Amino acid sequence: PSGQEFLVFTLGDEEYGIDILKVQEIRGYDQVTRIANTPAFIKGVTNLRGVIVPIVDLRIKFSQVDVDYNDNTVVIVLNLGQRVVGIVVDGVSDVLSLTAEQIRPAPEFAVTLSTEYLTGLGALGDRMLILVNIEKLLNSEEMAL
Amino acid sequence: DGIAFQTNILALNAAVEAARAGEQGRGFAVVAGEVRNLAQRSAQAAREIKSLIEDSVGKVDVGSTLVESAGET
Amino acid sequence: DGIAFQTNILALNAAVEAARAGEQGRGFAVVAGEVRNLAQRSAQAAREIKSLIEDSVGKVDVGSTLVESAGET
Amino acid sequence: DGIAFQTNILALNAAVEAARAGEQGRGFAVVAGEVRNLAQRSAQAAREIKSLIEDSVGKVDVGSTLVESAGET
Amino acid sequence: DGIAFQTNILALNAAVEAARAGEQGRGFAVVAGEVRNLAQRSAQAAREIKSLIEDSVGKVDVGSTLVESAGET
Amino acid sequence: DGIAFQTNILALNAAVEAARAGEQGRGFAVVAGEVRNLAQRSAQAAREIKSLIEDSVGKVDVGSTLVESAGET
Amino acid sequence: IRVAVEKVDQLINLVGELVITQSMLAQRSSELDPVNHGDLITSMGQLQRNARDLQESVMSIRMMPMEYVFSRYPRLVRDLAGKLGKQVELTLVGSSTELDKSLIERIIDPLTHLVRNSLDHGIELPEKRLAAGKNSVGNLILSAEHQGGNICIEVTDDGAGLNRERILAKAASQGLTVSENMSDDEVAMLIFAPGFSTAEQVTDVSGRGVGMDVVKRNIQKMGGHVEIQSKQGTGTTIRILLPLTLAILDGMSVRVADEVFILPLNAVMESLQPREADLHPLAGGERVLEVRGEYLPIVELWKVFNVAGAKTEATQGIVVILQSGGRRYALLVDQLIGQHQVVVKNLESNYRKVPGISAATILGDGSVALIVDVSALQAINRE
Amino acid sequence: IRVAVEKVDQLINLVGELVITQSMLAQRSSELDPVNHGDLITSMGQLQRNARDLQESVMSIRMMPMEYVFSRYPRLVRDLAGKLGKQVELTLVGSSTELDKSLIERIIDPLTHLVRNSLDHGIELPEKRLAAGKNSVGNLILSAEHQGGNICIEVTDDGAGLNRERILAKAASQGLTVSENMSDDEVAMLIFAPGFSTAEQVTDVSGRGVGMDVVKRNIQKMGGHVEIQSKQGTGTTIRILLPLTLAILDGMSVRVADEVFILPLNAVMESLQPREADLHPLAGGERVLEVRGEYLPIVELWKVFNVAGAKTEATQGIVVILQSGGRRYALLVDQLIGQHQVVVKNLESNYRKVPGISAATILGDGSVALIVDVSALQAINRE
């Protein structure tokens, strides 16, 4: 198959990647506007150049113990259809082209977690980056209740 | 060093914009490669200045004991 | 200062490619401007370092005169 | 200063030709705009040098008066 | 000197744009040639004024050398 | 300061009543706006008096120290 | 010249963005503070003056005859009257009047409901009318009139009107408040109440929905005003008044701590500073405020919306009186920022099941202010 | 939705006032000098960016099909061809192309004149065509295409084309310039000349007038470009290019003293700094400038418009080469401000007998700049 390009980033002292085409902007994390009684995944909203963007907690979703504005300093702004949303992360590394051959199965035993959500591990020089299906994850997790 | 870091992060964003532009982005991508190279080089030059500052301040620390000796002799 | 000037030349080349790429080059022009601003910031910072170095050198010459005066007392 | 003024006018003429070439003149237009900026900067640089020469000539007049006073001393 | 060198680089870009416009770039080539000629002339003038400053500063050093030599006699 | 705050809230209540009475509320709305201004002036003037009181009782501390000093001198 | 609807709606969105951009420029200009204040104020005032004239021209372009709405009514009225066993004649006044194309699309659903209410409940049977002593044929009047930068659209029948004693008896039977202390205006407000205007059949919510609450909400989402005037045996007059606007709502802006809330200005009765004497801790553990010898429940804004208050239990805030149908309650806030007209922004996916807030708006440099549903907030209080 | 034309023309007038108000704000902001330059430039750039999108949207709203113009041509062409003894068939390309309603109302008179020129002078008699060895039936092609922010409208025939030798012989007979030194471009420019394109019958001036000067002026008052490409025996192609804009003219802005003049950009050939050697005082008392070995009359701007100069007879200004038909002349000015696109303002009652200025525009804080008529200015010089 044709090569696939990923934006590579850090969360919980581990390395992850997502689809390049769905990424709009990469910006520094600054204080989020809170709304009461919201599901734990949603931090709140922020304003980017006049536009209100939802901000979501990737750290709680992946069961990571990192602290809000202390240990996470970057927001990656993602667009799916008419929905724009920022994922909170430690930082961004580089853009990486991966062939399908160098994508290894995810180690996780939970069925749709290790297939539909986790695409696999990208192997570069025996270093692994966790490839995440952000489109499936946002469409499923936010609408499950 | 912060400006050099900001330049590298801007270059990373610029590379994605060049990729989106496709055929039209090809020359801009080559320029972005040099921007990455200069961002690294600027940081290296700044580090060479830090090494000279450390050596110079080391001379001030050596000089301070000599100045105290000059005060006594 | 040379690296900042070279970075300004990279910004000029990016601006020429942005102009030739038209509508698809609209983002390239913003990057070329921002890179030029980062170069301007680097150059201005370098001039302030040069001024502080020149003042520091003058203090070193005065310190040399003071120890010479002490040496003759 | 006179050369800078010729360059400044040449940039205006170049811009009209670039405008006539339209979409295919856009890269040439960037060069004309930058040259127009440089010509204006060059005139200011010439004025500052002329001001420094005027101060220097005044200092020589003071220096001449001082050496005559040294002759009377 | 940096403005003259930058103008020379701009002349190369103009010459390339004239080449990239081919048979419709002949008027661009005339402008590129004039800017290139102006850059050569400004660079020569910059060397002459800098050399004249070096000779003039040399005369100040010769004059100060005479004054100290008179002082220590 | 309290009466000024009450005047400010009463002006806000008056603005709602003016909005309710529509074309008959237009003159009353101007009156409410000026009453809102008078509340701001009253509060501002009260704070300027607080600043004067804070200086004045500090002058009494200084005066008390000077009078005490006059006693022991 | 004839154009697509989407293009002229996009022009409205763009001139909305221009107004937002102008506010952003004003906020930056105020922070920057330019030296020549009169020159700045004159320049900004000229820009604002041009912007208002430009908006008026865009709205003037969007004008379309009321005839497009009115023309469809005589066939609908005659067949519907025949279905319900009535004899009715229809009078249409002001068909030549002008209003926005989006208003023309949005007005048909509530106007049709009002027309059905006149042909059903309002206008009696022809024998029944003859027995009363009036003409056997009913009179239904739909009138449209230009009013002060708004259009006023009036539905009037010669019916039996709204029986006030029956409404009061239903209110008394449910124990809503004392019938003697209900005004004619409060009785008119009760008509639009969510629990008092219920449809017989249960079905999923719609803009084409049944009931007076749906009518009130449809008018609110045109930024309009609506009122009901009625006399027993004379008939009912309902007036709908529509500005030239987007989804903009007239509100009262309030804070508790730094948290910003918007109270709809049609649901605000009055506002006041409460004294310690008039604050009554009546039995059940729910505080009461006395206003004019009337006992109203008093609710703290931070507590009911589940947000962090500023640590003050001392009596020094401002209390705003709100009405849900015929029932008044008092809502206590730290500060009032006053009356404002605010563009209404969707809550979208995150807030799917939130009940007390129907919308949001954006203030200053990106601050979020939450638009309260007054009857839902009363429902949260009794939860 | 369908709307009045005057309202959408008013929206154009108002957004023109917005651009003027933005320019006034920019001039005052530049004088004021806010401390945070990047924040100011960003804010002003965002306002400008919104203003361009808003203008583009307003222009997109004003779009109507070219079918409204084109659909009237086949009856007109067939009857007109019949009157002139021709056999001609009409091809219409790009009827579904889109352009402004005011362009539609202003293109018909020059387009009709071009169509008459093809059916009269361009396409020969059917026997004459058969004798030439080409189809007896003429081909007339009207084509419209969308080109880079403009619409390009092209009138092409399979006629006899324009006879260059005959045009040169007429120019030589009047003594306009040497025939050898006239380029094909200069010959094409000569077609639109006011004294070379004259009507047979004398009557009062009109927008519906006869002659190529009227055609060029009608296009100029839409802000458009127009060119003529022609080959002897093949036919003539005339292209009219109309931009997405108001009554705006592309100009070159110049000063003599502080007096501001605008030279139409299409009539500017080139501009240069004269040297003393190339300035020749030839007999008759009229100065000549040599450009590329060609002698051109040189005229001082302050003298010919009767204004006070800056007291300078020394050579140090800039000379602009202007062409009237096939004749070039050189116009000497103190300074160039450069190429500018300027809104065209009416002179009105005061200046109704003024011959060399056709319009004015307003610059900065109320400065007046005068729009030169190049052919009229040549006529003033020879008065």
Author numbering:
A (entry chain C): 14 to 158
B (entry chain M), C (entry chain N), D (entry chain K), E (entry chain L), F (entry chain E): 369 to 441
G (entry chain A), H (entry chain B): 264 to 646
Tell me what the authors wrote about this structure, in their words.
Upon ligand occupancy changes, chemoreceptors transmit signals across the inner membrane that modulate the autophosphorylation activity of a homodimeric histidine kinase CheA, which is coupled to receptor control by an adaptor protein CheW. CheA regulation requires the assembly of core-signaling units (CSUs)4,13,14 with a well-defined structure, comprising two chemoreceptor trimer-of-dimers (TOD), a single CheA dimer and two CheW monomers. Upon formation of the CSU, CheA undergoes pronounced tertiary rearrangement, increasing its basal activity nearly three orders of magnitude. CSUs further cluster into large, hexagonally packed chemosensory arrays, which place each CheA under the influence of as many as 20 receptors, giving rise to highly cooperative signaling responses.
Importantly, Q residues mimic the effects of methylated E residues on CheA activity, so a receptor with all four modification sites as glutamine (4Q) promotes high CheA activity, whereas a 4E receptor produces low kinase activity. We have now reconstituted in vitro monolayer systems using 4Q or 4E variants of the aspartate receptor signaling domain (TarCF), giving rise to TarCF4Q-CheA.P3.P4.P5-CheW and TarCF4E-CheA.P3.P4.P5-CheW monolayer arrays, which should display high and low kinase activity, respectively. For the 4Q system, we achieve an overall sub-nanometer resolution, which although anisotropic, enables the construction of an all-atom model of the E. coli CSU. To enable a detailed investigation of CSU structure and dynamics, we constructed an atomistic model of the E. coli complex, using the 8.4 Å-resolution 4Q density map to explicitly guide the modeling process. As no high-resolution structures exist of the cytoplasmic portion of E. coli Tar, we instead used a crystal structure of the E. coli Tsr TOD (PDB 1QU741), which shares a 96% sequence similarity with Tar. Models of the E. coli CheA.P3.P4 dimer and the CheA.P5-CheW dimer were generated using template-based homology modeling from crystal structures of Thermotoga maritima CheA and CheW (PDBs 4XIV17 and 4JPB42, respectively), which are sufficiently similar (75% sequence similarity for CheA.P3.P4.P5; 55% for CheW) to permit the construction of reliable models (Methods section). The resulting fits minimally altered the conformation of the initial models (backbone root-mean-squared-deviation (RMSD) = 1.8 Å) and oriented the two TODs symmetrically with a separation of 7.4 nm. The least resolved portion of the 4Q map corresponds to the CheA.P4 domains, indicating substantial conformational heterogeneity in this region of the CSU. Strikingly, the resulting fits collapsed into just two classes of CheA conformation with similar P4 CCC. We term these classes undipped and dipped to denote the relative position of P4 with respect to the rest of the CSU structure.
